[PDB]
Design a binder for these strands. Structure first.
Ligand SMILES: [Mg+2]
Lengths: 119, 149, 153, 50, 121, 203
RNA sequence: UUGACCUCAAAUCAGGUAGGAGUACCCGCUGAACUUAAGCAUAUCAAUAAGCGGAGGAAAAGAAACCAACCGGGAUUGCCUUAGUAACGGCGAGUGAAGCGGCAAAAGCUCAAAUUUGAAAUCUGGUACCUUCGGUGCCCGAGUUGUAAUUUGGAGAGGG
RNA sequence: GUUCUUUGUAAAGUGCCUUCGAAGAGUCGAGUUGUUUGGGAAUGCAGCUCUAAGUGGGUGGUAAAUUCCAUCUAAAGCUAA
RNA sequence: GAUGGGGAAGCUCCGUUUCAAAGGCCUGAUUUUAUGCAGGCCACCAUCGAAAGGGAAUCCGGUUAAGAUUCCGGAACCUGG
């Protein structure tokens, strides 16, 4: 069972923090019962629910920071794209498509014509 | 070592020659991929004939000067006599060689005539509009064969 | 420190050695009274700053909008010429009327040929103190040369 | 030694936890080929070399 | 002009105004939560017979504690989780790699009363 | 144009003006570090002929290297082989002092790219070079399509792979019958003419 | 006294970048000996193995300071051939390319050296806004010891 | 293919006459030494010494002097298959 | 055994206070106040290297299946504030 992320996403951060601390209290109360009982499979659901609550809290905070840094250069490095080191160091499309004005004049004057050959 | 009446052999296999052995197992697959590359290039340049027009030109040495063959590109003097600039000829599909010269009037006249027939045979499309599709041929060399005089 | 020691011992060495006359053709610079009055003359002919250039272009654009003069609403400029290749071309074309050469160009081989060229082409030259002075004359940091080529009446 | 470093004690703790026989329910799984702990170590027979 | 008087033959590097960092962007942009809080420093009690002899005789609770925790964190978290004032903490590292903490409570509180409140006896 | 005056004056190296100027500058360059940053090119005409432009992102370093042969680094001169390989003293390095100078400059500034180098001075002990370097992260070189080819990752350490002017000179890359051993790469040609080619239908 | 310039520094200054791995193939440096010569030292193995530096999906080379000697060809690369040839070699053992010819693929180019001189026309950065692989305005700065436009020898420039 | 912006009083090309036509230096080259090459009175590379010219320079596989001829344009740079 | 430097094609080598612009210390002053500006002092000049060298300070009694100068009871001491 456990908690559901889509219904966790509608709450505020204080309710999420309180739900997290009651989940941790429940996990401690199950861990003190695990030593007396032979098996206790209910611990795994509480563990995964704690993971779900932490994931929702982190994604809410990260989205708030993204909207704070929206529409400006120099956003933080973990928020900007990852792809690879070489693709990050590669030239952008604008810089790669930069051409001299002399070559631009030559390309406008003499572009590669489309032609066919029968008649 | 040396033995019965046999010719003296010179087999150069005293290095680690087995480290450099190229067996062309990929002849058939390389031919297939080569035809695939030709077809996709033709589809990419879908009206244009896949190769430029080459001049007729006289082969260099005394062993081969009896024959005539294809050159790299036309002389600037040849394209000026044909009546079009070198940049325009390069855009409409004529190979231009800036570094060969004309010392032979027969070769010059043959190349000028060859350019005249090419300009008569091609259709140049307008740069903006209708593009009246015209069912490409794939070999300007086959449509303009090199003829021995 | 070593940079202080190098910059002192370098000018020590440059007079310990017997300099060949193309150098110490310099270091007889202009005296301070005539230098002050020639900079007072040159200060009247100063190149235009960026802001007055910008309003000059707005006035030119408005004038070609209203009357369509061929960029000839503004009068003919009278400014000091600067820049090394520019003034060498002016001296070779005999257009320069008076040339000032800074005495402290730090490759000296940029300007050692300039007095001989001025003497051959007949242009009067003066070795003057201060590439910084020439730079603040032409609204730069360093100018290393200056030239009056055409003066008002 | 009695005066040991924490790295040595950590490796000793890991080897003490590894020192156990096979769990007996492993043999009941389908397509099980594991018969016994083949990586078992005893202090009299082989040394850790740490 | 006159030069500056120097009473020492040594030349030292002059003192320069050193500014503080004013970054254009944050370093990690989400500050991490508490790495080692009260629920992570106290894993579970040890309920072997040797440990259970201590809880009425010595008035000492025995807990299993994360290996990153020290005595200040153990004491603060026992005070926060169980609302009990503690006398002292003695820790050891067990031979299985875990950490065990003997927490001796003050005389006002009874560890036997607290252990079955927690849920083990 | 002052630059052709600077060139044709620079060819008179044993004229008294140039040997005085050389004599002062070689002392000034011994007094500095082995590798240090030059503020401006000493020969701006030579720099801009090799490709320098006076804009942001063009860097000049000055460098001196030790002259002479390369002593074979063997303990006490023992080579342990046939007498044809017993030479220690008169052996020569196959690359140039200009090449090892710009390679040390590139190792000093690995974030830059080596463009060219030129001789400035020498004495009995050292040879002095000035190295032109371009910053491939500066936006004035990311833009300006005449120079943004240096930002392509195939040009990392051209001076280490021998792709500069003196590198190609030392590798022997030139057209002609005098360069049959070294024309497309010496080891490439050696592999090409030491390969044994066998076809499916054996010729 | 004050304000510049040049040169050299310092900052947990604003923003970036390098290192290491992998390494079949690629670009260089460095560099043997076993072996063969029926011994062995030049030679050979081999401009190889080991060692070191540096890249990419390919790399390198590349648009002639070329090949030729002909009725001349025309960037580079690769295949077939030239050819086990010309040549080198205790002329011993052994080594050993290149031009032409046919084919695969084909593609060309740009800086420096010129006065814009009737107007540094050029560019990084910061800030504000926007449609954000960037654009516009403003402000410092770089730069005349030369950043833009114009030309690259096949040409081309200034006038008419 | 369909649509919006008119780029642009801008840019490019072509004919004839005239005056010109800037073209890379401790480099080219030479001696010597070492290495390398099929390269042989010396194929390339590198060290040291000497060190250019501008109808010039390089190459033209036997060294040198003299007279010609042919063919390119170095000492700066990019580029797919 | 780094750094500043100097060798080395380079992996790296030398050197440890050297041809270095090599730093921190207390009082405070100010009480937009933060810690700059008032001051003044000092020139070693990284760091690693001993469970037998140097070194702040704990003893007795009891207690466990297995721990104790470490736990319990009593009685002390040192360092920092
Ligand atoms: Mg040496």
């Amino acid at each position: 069972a456990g908690v559901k992320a889509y219904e966790l996403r509608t709450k505020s951060k204080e309710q999420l923090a309180s739900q997290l601390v009651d989940l941790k209290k429940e996990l401690a109360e199950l861990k003190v019962q695990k030593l007396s009982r032979p098996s206790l499979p209910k611990i795994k659901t509480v563990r995964k629910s704690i993971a779900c609550v932490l994931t929702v809290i982190n994604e809410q905070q990260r989205e708030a920071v993204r909207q704070l840094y929206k529409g400006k250069k120099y956003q933080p490095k973990d928020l900007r794209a990852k792809k690879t080191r070489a693709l990050r160091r590669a030239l952008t499309k604008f810089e790669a498509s930069q051409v001299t004005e002399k070559q631009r004049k030559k390309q406008i004057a003499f572009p590669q014509r489309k032609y066919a050959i029968k008649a | 070592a040396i033995s019965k009446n046999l010719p003296i052999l010179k087999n150069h296999f005293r290095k680690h020659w087995q480290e450099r052995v190229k067996v062309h197992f990929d002849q058939a697959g390389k031919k297939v991929s080569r035809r695939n590359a030709r077809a996709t290039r033709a589809a990419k340049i879908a009206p244009r004939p896949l190769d430029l027009l080459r001049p007729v030109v006289r082969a260099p040495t005394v062993k081969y000067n009896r024959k005539v063959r294809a050159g790299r590109g036309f002389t600037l003097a040849e394209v000026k006599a044909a009546g079009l600039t070198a940049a325009y000829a390069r855009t409409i599909g004529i190979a231009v060689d800036h570094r060969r010269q004309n010392r032979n009037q027969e070769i010059f006249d043959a190349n000028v005539q060859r350019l005249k027939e090419y300009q008569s045979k091609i259709i140049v499309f307008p740069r903006n509009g209708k593009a009246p599709e015209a069912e490409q041929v794939l070999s300007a060399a086959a449509t303009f064969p090199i003829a021995q005089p | 420190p070593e940079y202080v020691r190098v910059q002192r011992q370098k000018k020590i060495l440059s007079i310990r050695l017997k300099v060949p006359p193309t150098i110490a053709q310099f270091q007889y610079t202009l005296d301070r009274n005539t230098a002050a009055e020639t900079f007072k003359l040159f200060n009247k002919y100063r190149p235009e700053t960026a802001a007055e250039k910008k309003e000059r272009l707005t006035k030119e654009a408005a004038a070609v909008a209203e009357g369509k003069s061929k960029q000839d609403a503004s009068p003919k400029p009278y400014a000091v010429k600067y820049g090394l290749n520019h003034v060498v071309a002016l001296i070779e074309n005999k257009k320069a009327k008076l040339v000032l050469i800074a005495n402290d160009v730090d490759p000296i081989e940029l300007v050692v040929f300039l007095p001989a060229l001025c003497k051959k082409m007949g242009v009067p030259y003066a070795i003057v103190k201060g590439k910084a002075r020439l730079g603040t004359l032409v609204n730069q940091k360093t100018s290393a040369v200056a030239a009056l080529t055409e003066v008002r009446a | 030694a009695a005066q040991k470093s924490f790295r040595i004690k950590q490796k000793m703790a890991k080897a003490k936890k590894q020192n156990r026989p096979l769990p007996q329910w492993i043999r009941l799984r389908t397509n099980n080929t594991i018969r016994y702990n083949a990586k078992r170590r005893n202090w009299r027979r082989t040394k850790m070399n740490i | 002009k006159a030069l500056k008087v120097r009473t020492s033959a040594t030349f030292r590097l002059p003192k320069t105004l050193k500014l503080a960092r004013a970054p254009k962007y944050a370093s990690k942009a989400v500050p991490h939560y508490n790495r080692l809080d009260s629920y992570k420093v106290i894993e579970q009690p040890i309920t072997s017979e040797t440990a259970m002899k201590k809880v009425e005789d010595g008035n000492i609770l025995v807990f299993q504690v994360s290996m990153k925790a020290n005595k200040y964190q153990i004491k603060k978290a026992v005070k926060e989780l169980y609302e009990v004032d503690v006398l002292k903490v003695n820790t050891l590292v067990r031979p299985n790699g875990t950490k065990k903490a003997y927490v001796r409570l003050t005389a006002d509180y009874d560890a036997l009363d607290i252990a079955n409140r927690i849920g083990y006896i | 144009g002052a630059y052709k005056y600077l060139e044709e004056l620079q060819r008179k190296k044993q004229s008294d003006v140039l040997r005085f100027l050389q004599r002062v500058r070689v002392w000034e360059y011994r007094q500095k570090n082995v590798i240090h940053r030059a503020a401006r090119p000493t020969r701006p005409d030579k720099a801009r002929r090799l490709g320098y432009k006076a804009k942001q992102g063009f860097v000049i370093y000055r460098v001196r290297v030790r002259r002479g042969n390369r002593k074979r680094p063997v303990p006490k001169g023992a080579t342990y082989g046939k007498p044809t390989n017993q030479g220690v003293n008169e052996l020569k390095y196959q690359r140039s002092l200009r090449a090892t100078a710009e390679e040390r400059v590139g190792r000093r500034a690995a974030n830059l790219r080596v463009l060219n180098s030129y001789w400035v001075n020498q004495d009995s002990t050292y040879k002095y070079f000035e190295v032109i370097l371009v910053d491939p992260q500066h936006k004035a070189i990311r833009r300006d399509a005449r120079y943004n080819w240096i930002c392509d990752p195939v040009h990392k350490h051209r001076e280490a792979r021998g792709l500069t002017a003196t590198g190609k000179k030392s590798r022997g890359i030139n057209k002609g019958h005098k360069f049959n051993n070294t024309k497309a790469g010496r080891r490439k040609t050696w592999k090409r003419q030491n390969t044994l080619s066998l076809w499916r239908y054996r010729k």
